[PDB]
Amino acid sequence: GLMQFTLPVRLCKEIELFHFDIGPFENMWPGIFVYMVHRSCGTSCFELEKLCRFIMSVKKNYRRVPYHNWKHAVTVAHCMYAILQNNHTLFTDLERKGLLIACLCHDLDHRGFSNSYLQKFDHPLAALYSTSTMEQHHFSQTVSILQLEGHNIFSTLSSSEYEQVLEIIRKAIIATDLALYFGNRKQLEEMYQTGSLNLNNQSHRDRVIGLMMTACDLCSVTKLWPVTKLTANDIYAEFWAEGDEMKKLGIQPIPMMDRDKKDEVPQGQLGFYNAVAIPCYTTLTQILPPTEPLLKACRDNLSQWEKVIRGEE
Ligand SMILES: COc1ncc(C2CC2)nc1C(=O)N[C@@H]1CCN(c2ccc(Cl)cn2)C1
Ligand SMILES: [Mg+2]
Ligand SMILES: [Zn+2]
């Protein structure tokens, strides 16, 4: 009960900032996550014995892939922590509980392949889940791990709070499917501008949490340039492997995924920043003004990519 996690002074200060990097020491990531839960939620939210056992079963079920790995889980959970701490009073006790867990679990058992490649490969998961294939699998994996003996971090909730938290986690994980992002943001855009956005409306909250999940998921584009630049390599390592596997199925991959077309990457990042990232953090900033630092960092990085193209790096 009186066992807190503390961090060294540099991490203790930097962890509160949106652009924090969790560092290369894997063995510190669980403590960083429990630190964030204790400050976001309270030292009482979860039995520590059960949280630690849940955290380590989730780590085990992330694979050794270049990008969709344990480091991504904890990175995405940290961005959600930053959003929740910068927007104290807007979120319920259950929402803070659910969303940090949703983020840590959102890519459970990712193999590094898009939903597209699963469908062209004709993977069993594509027969089981026609849309949001991997995301339905990740939520499935979350429930499986919650049901292991000794792993049920929600055991002390009432029946109905338990059903509320699992519903929050399911919608939050489905929202990380970028194919659903475009429509979600366009609706949140219309609703903010026509003045109809209402946070007491559950279906509006659902949409707003969805956009938070997209924002945390893409948070690589909101770090300091040297972190953003080095993560891009990990992101492209998966893309190119997927492109390689498309060629094995006899399908020319889109140039983004073709490792012969590396020249085209800086322009690929422009496209992605303008079409996805900038609009995402814009709408988020309009709805939750204290998340502006994400939009500012994202614009800073757009400009760094513009510099790469102009040959200035
Ligand atoms: C060039 O792509 C990227 N570069 C950097 C990062 C960093 C945030 C990690 N992420 C991506 C990305 O998620 N691209 C994905 C591939 C292209 N994008 C897309 C567009 C429409 C639909 Cl329906 C699906 N996918 C998303
Ligand atoms: Mg995902
Ligand atoms: Zn992710």
Side-chain angles (χ1 to χ4, degrees), residues 67-68 72 177-180 182 217-221 231-232 235-236 239 254 256-257 265 268-269 271-273 275-277 281:
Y67 178 72
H68 287 98
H72 169 63
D177 172 3
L178 210 52
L180 296 181
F182 298 102
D217 202 14
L218 307 193
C219 74
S220 159
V221 295
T231 310
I235 296 155
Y236 275 90
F239 287 171
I254 66 197
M256 177 199 297
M257 291 188 172
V265 163
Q269 290 299 290
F272 184 79
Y273 275 70
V276 185
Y281 294 115

PDB file of all heavy atoms in Angstrom, residues 67-68 72 177-180 182 217-221 231-232 235-236 239 254 256-257 265 268-269 271-273 275-277 281, ligand 1:
ATOM      1  N   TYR A  67       9.384  -2.757 -34.805  1.00  0.00           N
ATOM      2  CA  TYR A  67       8.592  -1.565 -34.401  1.00  0.00           C
ATOM      3  C   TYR A  67       7.412  -1.937 -33.490  1.00  0.00           C
ATOM      4  O   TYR A  67       7.282  -1.294 -32.454  1.00  0.00           O
ATOM      5  CB  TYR A  67       8.106  -0.759 -35.612  1.00  0.00           C
ATOM      6  CG  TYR A  67       7.255   0.428 -35.209  1.00  0.00           C
ATOM      7  CD1 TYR A  67       7.838   1.533 -34.601  1.00  0.00           C
ATOM      8  CD2 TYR A  67       5.865   0.409 -35.326  1.00  0.00           C
ATOM      9  CE1 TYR A  67       7.079   2.617 -34.187  1.00  0.00           C
ATOM     10  CE2 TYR A  67       5.091   1.480 -34.907  1.00  0.00           C
ATOM     11  CZ  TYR A  67       5.703   2.587 -34.340  1.00  0.00           C
ATOM     12  OH  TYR A  67       4.975   3.654 -33.900  1.00  0.00           O
ATOM     13  N   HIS A  68       6.543  -2.862 -33.900  1.00  0.00           N
ATOM     14  CA  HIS A  68       5.328  -3.267 -33.147  1.00  0.00           C
ATOM     15  C   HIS A  68       5.687  -4.190 -31.977  1.00  0.00           C
ATOM     16  O   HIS A  68       5.178  -5.313 -31.901  1.00  0.00           O
ATOM     17  CB  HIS A  68       4.313  -3.892 -34.095  1.00  0.00           C
ATOM     18  CG  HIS A  68       3.659  -2.876 -34.961  1.00  0.00           C
ATOM     19  ND1 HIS A  68       4.078  -2.633 -36.241  1.00  0.00           N
ATOM     20  CD2 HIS A  68       2.673  -1.991 -34.705  1.00  0.00           C
ATOM     21  CE1 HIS A  68       3.336  -1.674 -36.758  1.00  0.00           C
ATOM     22  NE2 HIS A  68       2.466  -1.264 -35.839  1.00  0.00           N
ATOM     23  N   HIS A  72       7.043  -0.136 -28.061  1.00  0.00           N
ATOM     24  CA  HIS A  72       5.943   0.637 -28.690  1.00  0.00           C
ATOM     25  C   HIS A  72       4.779   0.672 -27.691  1.00  0.00           C
ATOM     26  O   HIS A  72       4.219   1.744 -27.463  1.00  0.00           O
ATOM     27  CB  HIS A  72       5.598   0.073 -30.088  1.00  0.00           C
ATOM     28  CG  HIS A  72       4.340   0.639 -30.659  1.00  0.00           C
ATOM     29  ND1 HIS A  72       4.212   1.966 -30.953  1.00  0.00           N
ATOM     30  CD2 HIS A  72       3.150   0.071 -30.964  1.00  0.00           C
ATOM     31  CE1 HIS A  72       3.000   2.200 -31.446  1.00  0.00           C
ATOM     32  NE2 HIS A  72       2.323   1.057 -31.443  1.00  0.00           N
ATOM     33  N   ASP A 177      -7.123   1.039 -35.241  1.00  0.00           N
ATOM     34  CA  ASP A 177      -7.131   0.606 -36.666  1.00  0.00           C
ATOM     35  C   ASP A 177      -7.207   1.874 -37.518  1.00  0.00           C
ATOM     36  O   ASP A 177      -8.260   2.490 -37.553  1.00  0.00           O
ATOM     37  CB  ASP A 177      -8.292  -0.333 -36.997  1.00  0.00           C
ATOM     38  CG  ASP A 177      -8.400  -0.623 -38.490  1.00  0.00           C
ATOM     39  OD1 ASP A 177      -7.531  -0.132 -39.248  1.00  0.00           O
ATOM     40  OD2 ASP A 177      -9.347  -1.348 -38.891  1.00  0.00           O
ATOM     41  N   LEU A 178      -6.125   2.259 -38.170  1.00  0.00           N
ATOM     42  CA  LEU A 178      -6.042   3.581 -38.851  1.00  0.00           C
ATOM     43  C   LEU A 178      -7.132   3.715 -39.933  1.00  0.00           C
ATOM     44  O   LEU A 178      -7.482   4.840 -40.257  1.00  0.00           O
ATOM     45  CB  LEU A 178      -4.644   3.741 -39.456  1.00  0.00           C
ATOM     46  CG  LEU A 178      -4.119   5.164 -39.558  1.00  0.00           C
ATOM     47  CD1 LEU A 178      -4.203   5.904 -38.232  1.00  0.00           C
ATOM     48  CD2 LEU A 178      -2.686   5.115 -40.029  1.00  0.00           C
ATOM     49  N   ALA A 179      -7.647   2.619 -40.489  1.00  0.00           N
ATOM     50  CA  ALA A 179      -8.722   2.661 -41.510  1.00  0.00           C
ATOM     51  C   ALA A 179      -9.975   3.308 -40.894  1.00  0.00           C
ATOM     52  O   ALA A 179     -10.729   3.924 -41.647  1.00  0.00           O
ATOM     53  CB  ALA A 179      -9.006   1.278 -42.068  1.00  0.00           C
ATOM     54  N   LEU A 180     -10.157   3.227 -39.571  1.00  0.00           N
ATOM     55  CA  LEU A 180     -11.326   3.814 -38.865  1.00  0.00           C
ATOM     56  C   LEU A 180     -11.047   5.256 -38.441  1.00  0.00           C
ATOM     57  O   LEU A 180     -12.012   5.952 -38.091  1.00  0.00           O
ATOM     58  CB  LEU A 180     -11.667   2.959 -37.641  1.00  0.00           C
ATOM     59  CG  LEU A 180     -12.113   1.533 -37.962  1.00  0.00           C
ATOM     60  CD1 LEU A 180     -12.452   0.783 -36.687  1.00  0.00           C
ATOM     61  CD2 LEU A 180     -13.300   1.525 -38.909  1.00  0.00           C
ATOM     62  N   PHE A 182      -9.873   7.998 -40.135  1.00  0.00           N
ATOM     63  CA  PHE A 182     -10.274   9.058 -41.106  1.00  0.00           C
ATOM     64  C   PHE A 182     -11.726   9.495 -40.863  1.00  0.00           C
ATOM     65  O   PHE A 182     -11.983  10.688 -40.641  1.00  0.00           O
ATOM     66  CB  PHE A 182     -10.034   8.569 -42.535  1.00  0.00           C
ATOM     67  CG  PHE A 182      -8.583   8.283 -42.799  1.00  0.00           C
ATOM     68  CD1 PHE A 182      -8.116   6.974 -42.806  1.00  0.00           C
ATOM     69  CD2 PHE A 182      -7.671   9.325 -42.922  1.00  0.00           C
ATOM     70  CE1 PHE A 182      -6.769   6.710 -43.002  1.00  0.00           C
ATOM     71  CE2 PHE A 182      -6.327   9.059 -43.142  1.00  0.00           C
ATOM     72  CZ  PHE A 182      -5.877   7.749 -43.172  1.00  0.00           C
ATOM     73  N   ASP A 217      -0.911   6.391 -30.479  1.00  0.00           N
ATOM     74  CA  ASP A 217      -0.366   5.348 -31.370  1.00  0.00           C
ATOM     75  C   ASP A 217       0.640   5.940 -32.338  1.00  0.00           C
ATOM     76  O   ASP A 217       1.593   5.219 -32.674  1.00  0.00           O
ATOM     77  CB  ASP A 217      -1.449   4.653 -32.181  1.00  0.00           C
ATOM     78  CG  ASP A 217      -1.011   3.284 -32.659  1.00  0.00           C
ATOM     79  OD1 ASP A 217       0.004   2.764 -32.150  1.00  0.00           O
ATOM     80  OD2 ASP A 217      -1.703   2.740 -33.508  1.00  0.00           O
ATOM     81  N   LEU A 218       0.388   7.143 -32.853  1.00  0.00           N
ATOM     82  CA  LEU A 218       1.297   7.786 -33.830  1.00  0.00           C
ATOM     83  C   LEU A 218       2.351   8.622 -33.102  1.00  0.00           C
ATOM     84  O   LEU A 218       3.082   9.286 -33.812  1.00  0.00           O
ATOM     85  CB  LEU A 218       0.512   8.674 -34.803  1.00  0.00           C
ATOM     86  CG  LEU A 218      -0.669   8.040 -35.537  1.00  0.00           C
ATOM     87  CD1 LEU A 218      -1.102   8.964 -36.654  1.00  0.00           C
ATOM     88  CD2 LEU A 218      -0.338   6.671 -36.094  1.00  0.00           C
ATOM     89  N   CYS A 219       2.478   8.557 -31.767  1.00  0.00           N
ATOM     90  CA  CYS A 219       3.235   9.589 -31.002  1.00  0.00           C
ATOM     91  C   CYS A 219       4.725   9.581 -31.373  1.00  0.00           C
ATOM     92  O   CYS A 219       5.422  10.503 -30.966  1.00  0.00           O
ATOM     93  CB  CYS A 219       3.077   9.461 -29.492  1.00  0.00           C
ATOM     94  SG  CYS A 219       3.999   8.079 -28.777  1.00  0.00           S
ATOM     95  N   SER A 220       5.206   8.600 -32.130  1.00  0.00           N
ATOM     96  CA  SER A 220       6.584   8.631 -32.691  1.00  0.00           C
ATOM     97  C   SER A 220       6.819   9.941 -33.474  1.00  0.00           C
ATOM     98  O   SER A 220       7.961  10.406 -33.502  1.00  0.00           O
ATOM     99  CB  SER A 220       6.861   7.408 -33.543  1.00  0.00           C
ATOM    100  OG  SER A 220       7.929   7.650 -34.445  1.00  0.00           O
ATOM    101  N   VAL A 221       5.794  10.506 -34.117  1.00  0.00           N
ATOM    102  CA  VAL A 221       5.946  11.697 -35.004  1.00  0.00           C
ATOM    103  C   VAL A 221       5.972  12.971 -34.146  1.00  0.00           C
ATOM    104  O   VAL A 221       6.254  14.041 -34.718  1.00  0.00           O
ATOM    105  CB  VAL A 221       4.877  11.768 -36.114  1.00  0.00           C
ATOM    106  CG1 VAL A 221       4.993  10.616 -37.089  1.00  0.00           C
ATOM    107  CG2 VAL A 221       3.454  11.879 -35.582  1.00  0.00           C
ATOM    108  N   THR A 231      13.304   6.049 -35.072  1.00  0.00           N
ATOM    109  CA  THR A 231      12.087   5.190 -35.082  1.00  0.00           C
ATOM    110  C   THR A 231      11.620   4.918 -36.521  1.00  0.00           C
ATOM    111  O   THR A 231      11.156   3.770 -36.790  1.00  0.00           O
ATOM    112  CB  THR A 231      10.972   5.793 -34.233  1.00  0.00           C
ATOM    113  OG1 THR A 231      11.516   6.138 -32.959  1.00  0.00           O
ATOM    114  CG2 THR A 231       9.818   4.841 -34.047  1.00  0.00           C
ATOM    115  N   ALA A 232      11.726   5.910 -37.415  1.00  0.00           N
ATOM    116  CA  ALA A 232      11.340   5.805 -38.842  1.00  0.00           C
ATOM    117  C   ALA A 232      12.004   4.585 -39.482  1.00  0.00           C
ATOM    118  O   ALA A 232      11.303   3.866 -40.210  1.00  0.00           O
ATOM    119  CB  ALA A 232      11.691   7.068 -39.598  1.00  0.00           C
ATOM    120  N   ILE A 235      10.164   1.527 -38.263  1.00  0.00           N
ATOM    121  CA  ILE A 235       8.844   1.525 -38.954  1.00  0.00           C
ATOM    122  C   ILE A 235       9.089   0.971 -40.361  1.00  0.00           C
ATOM    123  O   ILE A 235       8.380   0.061 -40.730  1.00  0.00           O
ATOM    124  CB  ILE A 235       8.191   2.924 -38.971  1.00  0.00           C
ATOM    125  CG1 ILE A 235       7.871   3.416 -37.561  1.00  0.00           C
ATOM    126  CG2 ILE A 235       6.945   2.935 -39.839  1.00  0.00           C
ATOM    127  CD1 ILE A 235       7.807   4.921 -37.449  1.00  0.00           C
ATOM    128  N   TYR A 236      10.089   1.477 -41.089  1.00  0.00           N
ATOM    129  CA  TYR A 236      10.334   1.098 -42.516  1.00  0.00           C
ATOM    130  C   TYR A 236      10.860  -0.345 -42.601  1.00  0.00           C
ATOM    131  O   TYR A 236      10.624  -1.007 -43.648  1.00  0.00           O
ATOM    132  CB  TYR A 236      11.171   2.148 -43.273  1.00  0.00           C
ATOM    133  CG  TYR A 236      10.294   3.255 -43.812  1.00  0.00           C
ATOM    134  CD1 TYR A 236      10.047   4.381 -43.052  1.00  0.00           C
ATOM    135  CD2 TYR A 236       9.619   3.137 -45.022  1.00  0.00           C
ATOM    136  CE1 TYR A 236       9.177   5.369 -43.476  1.00  0.00           C
ATOM    137  CE2 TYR A 236       8.741   4.119 -45.464  1.00  0.00           C
ATOM    138  CZ  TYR A 236       8.511   5.236 -44.678  1.00  0.00           C
ATOM    139  OH  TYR A 236       7.668   6.239 -45.041  1.00  0.00           O
ATOM    140  N   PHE A 239       7.732  -2.313 -42.833  1.00  0.00           N
ATOM    141  CA  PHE A 239       7.094  -2.018 -44.137  1.00  0.00           C
ATOM    142  C   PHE A 239       7.804  -2.814 -45.228  1.00  0.00           C
ATOM    143  O   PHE A 239       7.110  -3.494 -45.997  1.00  0.00           O
ATOM    144  CB  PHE A 239       7.100  -0.515 -44.435  1.00  0.00           C
ATOM    145  CG  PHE A 239       6.137   0.314 -43.618  1.00  0.00           C
ATOM    146  CD1 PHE A 239       6.188   1.698 -43.676  1.00  0.00           C
ATOM    147  CD2 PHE A 239       5.159  -0.267 -42.819  1.00  0.00           C
ATOM    148  CE1 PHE A 239       5.297   2.474 -42.943  1.00  0.00           C
ATOM    149  CE2 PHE A 239       4.272   0.506 -42.088  1.00  0.00           C
ATOM    150  CZ  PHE A 239       4.341   1.877 -42.150  1.00  0.00           C
ATOM    151  N   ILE A 254       2.955  -1.398 -52.879  1.00  0.00           N
ATOM    152  CA  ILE A 254       2.983   0.095 -52.939  1.00  0.00           C
ATOM    153  C   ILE A 254       4.419   0.555 -52.650  1.00  0.00           C
ATOM    154  O   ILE A 254       5.134  -0.071 -51.875  1.00  0.00           O
ATOM    155  CB  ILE A 254       1.930   0.707 -51.981  1.00  0.00           C
ATOM    156  CG1 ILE A 254       2.233   0.426 -50.504  1.00  0.00           C
ATOM    157  CG2 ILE A 254       0.520   0.252 -52.364  1.00  0.00           C
ATOM    158  CD1 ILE A 254       1.054   0.636 -49.558  1.00  0.00           C
ATOM    159  N   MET A 256       5.898   2.667 -50.832  1.00  0.00           N
ATOM    160  CA  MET A 256       6.151   2.868 -49.378  1.00  0.00           C
ATOM    161  C   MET A 256       6.766   1.595 -48.775  1.00  0.00           C
ATOM    162  O   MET A 256       7.631   1.708 -47.889  1.00  0.00           O
ATOM    163  CB  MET A 256       4.828   3.187 -48.677  1.00  0.00           C
ATOM    164  CG  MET A 256       4.922   3.348 -47.184  1.00  0.00           C
ATOM    165  SD  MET A 256       3.277   3.171 -46.463  1.00  0.00           S
ATOM    166  CE  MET A 256       2.455   4.576 -47.221  1.00  0.00           C
ATOM    167  N   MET A 257       6.330   0.429 -49.241  1.00  0.00           N
ATOM    168  CA  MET A 257       6.720  -0.884 -48.683  1.00  0.00           C
ATOM    169  C   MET A 257       7.812  -1.539 -49.541  1.00  0.00           C
ATOM    170  O   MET A 257       8.275  -2.623 -49.154  1.00  0.00           O
ATOM    171  CB  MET A 257       5.483  -1.785 -48.577  1.00  0.00           C
ATOM    172  CG  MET A 257       4.512  -1.291 -47.520  1.00  0.00           C
ATOM    173  SD  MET A 257       3.179  -2.445 -47.227  1.00  0.00           S
ATOM    174  CE  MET A 257       2.409  -1.691 -45.793  1.00  0.00           C
ATOM    175  N   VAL A 265      11.094   7.887 -49.459  1.00  0.00           N
ATOM    176  CA  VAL A 265      10.662   7.835 -48.025  1.00  0.00           C
ATOM    177  C   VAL A 265      10.375   9.246 -47.508  1.00  0.00           C
ATOM    178  O   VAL A 265       9.307   9.486 -46.944  1.00  0.00           O
ATOM    179  CB  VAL A 265      11.691   7.106 -47.129  1.00  0.00           C
ATOM    180  CG1 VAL A 265      11.481   7.411 -45.649  1.00  0.00           C
ATOM    181  CG2 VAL A 265      11.676   5.605 -47.371  1.00  0.00           C
ATOM    182  N   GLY A 268       7.195  10.149 -48.708  1.00  0.00           N
ATOM    183  CA  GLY A 268       6.240   9.294 -47.972  1.00  0.00           C
ATOM    184  C   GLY A 268       5.920   9.849 -46.588  1.00  0.00           C
ATOM    185  O   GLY A 268       4.740   9.785 -46.181  1.00  0.00           O
ATOM    186  N   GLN A 269       6.913  10.399 -45.880  1.00  0.00           N
ATOM    187  CA  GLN A 269       6.701  11.024 -44.547  1.00  0.00           C
ATOM    188  C   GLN A 269       5.889  12.320 -44.709  1.00  0.00           C
ATOM    189  O   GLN A 269       4.968  12.535 -43.904  1.00  0.00           O
ATOM    190  CB  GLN A 269       8.031  11.217 -43.810  1.00  0.00           C
ATOM    191  CG  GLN A 269       8.655   9.908 -43.350  1.00  0.00           C
ATOM    192  CD  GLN A 269       7.763   9.164 -42.381  1.00  0.00           C
ATOM    193  OE1 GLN A 269       7.561   9.574 -41.243  1.00  0.00           O
ATOM    194  NE2 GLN A 269       7.196   8.059 -42.833  1.00  0.00           N
ATOM    195  N   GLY A 271       3.576  13.019 -47.007  1.00  0.00           N
ATOM    196  CA  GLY A 271       2.231  12.492 -47.286  1.00  0.00           C
ATOM    197  C   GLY A 271       1.565  12.141 -45.982  1.00  0.00           C
ATOM    198  O   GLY A 271       0.500  12.721 -45.667  1.00  0.00           O
ATOM    199  N   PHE A 272       2.239  11.287 -45.211  1.00  0.00           N
ATOM    200  CA  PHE A 272       1.752  10.751 -43.921  1.00  0.00           C
ATOM    201  C   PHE A 272       1.517  11.883 -42.916  1.00  0.00           C
ATOM    202  O   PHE A 272       0.500  11.846 -42.236  1.00  0.00           O
ATOM    203  CB  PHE A 272       2.715   9.710 -43.338  1.00  0.00           C
ATOM    204  CG  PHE A 272       2.165   9.110 -42.073  1.00  0.00           C
ATOM    205  CD1 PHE A 272       1.201   8.115 -42.130  1.00  0.00           C
ATOM    206  CD2 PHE A 272       2.526   9.614 -40.836  1.00  0.00           C
ATOM    207  CE1 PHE A 272       0.656   7.603 -40.961  1.00  0.00           C
ATOM    208  CE2 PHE A 272       1.989   9.098 -39.669  1.00  0.00           C
ATOM    209  CZ  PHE A 272       1.053   8.089 -39.733  1.00  0.00           C
ATOM    210  N   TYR A 273       2.417  12.852 -42.811  1.00  0.00           N
ATOM    211  CA  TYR A 273       2.274  13.994 -41.866  1.00  0.00           C
ATOM    212  C   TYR A 273       1.059  14.838 -42.257  1.00  0.00           C
ATOM    213  O   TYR A 273       0.238  15.180 -41.366  1.00  0.00           O
ATOM    214  CB  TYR A 273       3.565  14.814 -41.793  1.00  0.00           C
ATOM    215  CG  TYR A 273       4.585  14.270 -40.819  1.00  0.00           C
ATOM    216  CD1 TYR A 273       5.259  13.077 -41.065  1.00  0.00           C
ATOM    217  CD2 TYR A 273       4.832  14.911 -39.616  1.00  0.00           C
ATOM    218  CE1 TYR A 273       6.180  12.563 -40.166  1.00  0.00           C
ATOM    219  CE2 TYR A 273       5.747  14.413 -38.700  1.00  0.00           C
ATOM    220  CZ  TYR A 273       6.424  13.241 -38.983  1.00  0.00           C
ATOM    221  OH  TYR A 273       7.329  12.772 -38.094  1.00  0.00           O
ATOM    222  N   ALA A 275      -1.551  14.073 -44.564  1.00  0.00           N
ATOM    223  CA  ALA A 275      -2.813  13.296 -44.693  1.00  0.00           C
ATOM    224  C   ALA A 275      -3.294  12.718 -43.356  1.00  0.00           C
ATOM    225  O   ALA A 275      -4.523  12.590 -43.194  1.00  0.00           O
ATOM    226  CB  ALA A 275      -2.652  12.200 -45.710  1.00  0.00           C
ATOM    227  N   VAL A 276      -2.403  12.384 -42.414  1.00  0.00           N
ATOM    228  CA  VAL A 276      -2.788  11.637 -41.170  1.00  0.00           C
ATOM    229  C   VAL A 276      -2.415  12.403 -39.897  1.00  0.00           C
ATOM    230  O   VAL A 276      -3.354  12.660 -39.096  1.00  0.00           O
ATOM    231  CB  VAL A 276      -2.183  10.215 -41.152  1.00  0.00           C
ATOM    232  CG1 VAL A 276      -2.650   9.395 -39.955  1.00  0.00           C
ATOM    233  CG2 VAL A 276      -2.463   9.464 -42.447  1.00  0.00           C
ATOM    234  N   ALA A 277      -1.109  12.629 -39.643  1.00  0.00           N
ATOM    235  CA  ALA A 277      -0.581  13.087 -38.325  1.00  0.00           C
ATOM    236  C   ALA A 277      -1.057  14.515 -38.002  1.00  0.00           C
ATOM    237  O   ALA A 277      -1.611  14.707 -36.889  1.00  0.00           O
ATOM    238  CB  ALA A 277       0.928  13.015 -38.275  1.00  0.00           C
ATOM    239  N   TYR A 281      -3.574  15.581 -34.756  1.00  0.00           N
ATOM    240  CA  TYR A 281      -3.168  16.418 -33.593  1.00  0.00           C
ATOM    241  C   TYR A 281      -3.879  17.782 -33.640  1.00  0.00           C
ATOM    242  O   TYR A 281      -4.168  18.304 -32.566  1.00  0.00           O
ATOM    243  CB  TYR A 281      -1.639  16.521 -33.511  1.00  0.00           C
ATOM    244  CG  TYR A 281      -0.970  15.204 -33.207  1.00  0.00           C
ATOM    245  CD1 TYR A 281      -0.134  14.604 -34.133  1.00  0.00           C
ATOM    246  CD2 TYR A 281      -1.240  14.520 -32.027  1.00  0.00           C
ATOM    247  CE1 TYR A 281       0.451  13.380 -33.887  1.00  0.00           C
ATOM    248  CE2 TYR A 281      -0.660  13.287 -31.764  1.00  0.00           C
ATOM    249  CZ  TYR A 281       0.183  12.720 -32.701  1.00  0.00           C
ATOM    250  OH  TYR A 281       0.772  11.520 -32.463  1.00  0.00           O
TER     251      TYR A 281
HETATM  252  C1  LIG B   1       4.454   6.335 -43.785  1.00  0.00           C
HETATM  253  O1  LIG B   1       3.705   5.718 -42.708  1.00  0.00           O
HETATM  254  C2  LIG B   1       4.049   5.938 -41.416  1.00  0.00           C
HETATM  255  N1  LIG B   1       5.162   6.668 -41.160  1.00  0.00           N
HETATM  256  C3  LIG B   1       5.431   6.884 -39.843  1.00  0.00           C
HETATM  257  C4  LIG B   1       4.599   6.358 -38.804  1.00  0.00           C
HETATM  258  C5  LIG B   1       4.909   6.624 -37.396  1.00  0.00           C
HETATM  259  C6  LIG B   1       3.716   6.826 -36.509  1.00  0.00           C
HETATM  260  C7  LIG B   1       4.600   5.629 -36.321  1.00  0.00           C
HETATM  261  N2  LIG B   1       3.489   5.632 -39.068  1.00  0.00           N
HETATM  262  C8  LIG B   1       3.201   5.419 -40.360  1.00  0.00           C
HETATM  263  C9  LIG B   1       1.949   4.598 -40.579  1.00  0.00           C
HETATM  264  O2  LIG B   1       1.339   4.217 -39.555  1.00  0.00           O
HETATM  265  N3  LIG B   1       1.582   4.360 -41.909  1.00  0.00           N
HETATM  266  C10 LIG B   1       0.456   3.589 -42.404  1.00  0.00           C
HETATM  267  C11 LIG B   1       0.623   3.135 -43.879  1.00  0.00           C
HETATM  268  C12 LIG B   1      -0.050   4.219 -44.742  1.00  0.00           C
HETATM  269  N4  LIG B   1      -1.149   4.713 -43.937  1.00  0.00           N
HETATM  270  C13 LIG B   1      -2.518   4.333 -44.218  1.00  0.00           C
HETATM  271  C14 LIG B   1      -3.414   5.190 -44.917  1.00  0.00           C
HETATM  272  C15 LIG B   1      -4.743   4.782 -45.101  1.00  0.00           C
HETATM  273  C16 LIG B   1      -5.179   3.545 -44.569  1.00  0.00           C
HETATM  274 CL1  LIG B   1      -6.793   2.992 -44.758  1.00  0.00          CL
HETATM  275  C17 LIG B   1      -4.223   2.763 -43.869  1.00  0.00           C
HETATM  276  N5  LIG B   1      -2.941   3.132 -43.687  1.00  0.00           N
HETATM  277  C18 LIG B   1      -0.871   4.369 -42.537  1.00  0.00           C
END
